[model samples]
Target: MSISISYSTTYSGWTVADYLADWSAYFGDVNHRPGQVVDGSNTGGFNPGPFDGSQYALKSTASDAAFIAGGDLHYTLFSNPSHTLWGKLDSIALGDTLTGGASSGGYALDSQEVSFSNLGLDSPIAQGRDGTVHKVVYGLMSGDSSALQGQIDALLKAVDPSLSINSTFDQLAAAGVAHATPAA
Candidate 1:
């Protein structure tokens, strides 16, 4: 019932905290207090990135159960420019441009729409498909919702222009490099 999109890339020079702080602001209005760590690899000794701490998650609603029942949107940032922004396009809506980069004091160097989804919370945290990380979005109104298309368009537009996939959503979708359904 939800559609998710993820943008993955690398940052030459930026701390994990920098991405977290920047995205926390860009998405705006996520319940960040005592940011919850929802997974093991992100928070424990088996971490993959430079920082190992509670995975900070943002929710649009105050109710804790909304997270499970699809009342709130969730977003998080990871090392290596790996950030997952999940929420209904009809819910939180999309931003104009993803600000806060290395040039502007934040480390977001590049990004792309790595994945898309039409289901919600198959897992508590954003889940990957076929062993690669993907975006986790849920609760869109329908499969052909224009809001979903606009959201994809916005994320693809926000990516670094140097990359070939930096074209329109139709162009990227035609390329078949992005867009995959999450596994059950």
Candidate 2:
């Protein structure tokens, strides 16, 4: 029902190349690769071989790494209005666990499919990481704050419960989320 995750604050609100490298290190290894893969950039050409920093995969190249870096940072944004433009979701607490309602990956993949349905987003069928990615990307584009938050809250509870915030941006102004200059 659960899998442990690296609750490292080092990368909690960071957009560094290191984060991308970790993504490649985990997903590119043939043995470590998820049964399904997630590439939000849609660059298509995921190599199952080891990531030598020259492979074609998520966060492999500068362009490829850009989306996730941006996506990672997107989770921590806060504004006076707390509008969709300021932040993609109300929360992204999806933990890294592989299963369970609180998990950030497969479990959320299943939950948000229903959640997305509630928001009228006909997302493509996905499994594991792809499933999670599809949900967030769709929510990002859906322009619905509540829908976006659903995907986030589940992950944060697992990623770093302390990093998660659920309330007004003004609350964030007081509560504090790293990348949120003014609340993630």
Candidate 3:
């Protein structure tokens, strides 16, 4: 079987609800992404935030196949962040692991021990029991990974300073957040 992962804040100090709220707000930021902007005028019908489009957008409704099966799965990150379906982080299941978090070229990573820090995810990750994938980061690698990740981390830090964003493979690996290829 292929390797899947689950990130839990059950051990991190922050609660799931608070973390998600922060994430929603983070993903919904209306900052203008230099060239690729969804709603530069901040008048889009998306989330009611200070901004409408961004380089790291979270979509509630999408044409992506994964969305229909993912349920009311919170928010899904666009692979290109320009609202393109180039890649995506499928779903964010609230009391469980986020179903799909596919990041990297096209929609997959190198299978090496990918660190959250390298991806620009800081803290307040999804919290839940075992087998639950907090959030599937399937996109981002298609664009400026670090810049996009930095936006996410900035959001977390803005919401609260105690969220615990992963900075190394070891930190997330020990906690079951690191994506590592299994030995066959």
Compared with the true structure, what per-residue lDDT tens digits does model 3 show for residues 15-65?
323444444443333332345355534212222222221122232222111
Where does candidate 1 have its weakest 10-residue lDDT segment? 62-71
lDDT string for model 1 (1-184, tens) is 2333332333213222243334334433332223444544222110112322112122323221111112223334553223433333222222122223223432111222132433222222344221111222222111112333344444444443322322433334344423332335
Better of 2 and 3 by lDDT: 3
lDDT of 3: 0.29
**For residues 1-184, could you state the per-residue lDDT of candidate 2 as single tens digits?**
2211222343444332233334333333222122323443333221121211111112222212111111111211123222112221122222122222112221221111101111222222223223443445433222222334454345444544643324322322233322222124
Candidate 2, poorest ten consecutive residues by summed lDDT: 109-118
Q: TM-score winner among the candidates? A: 2
**lDDT (Cα atoms) of all candidates against the true structure:** 0.29, 0.27, 0.29
**Better structure of 2 and 3 per TM-score:** 2
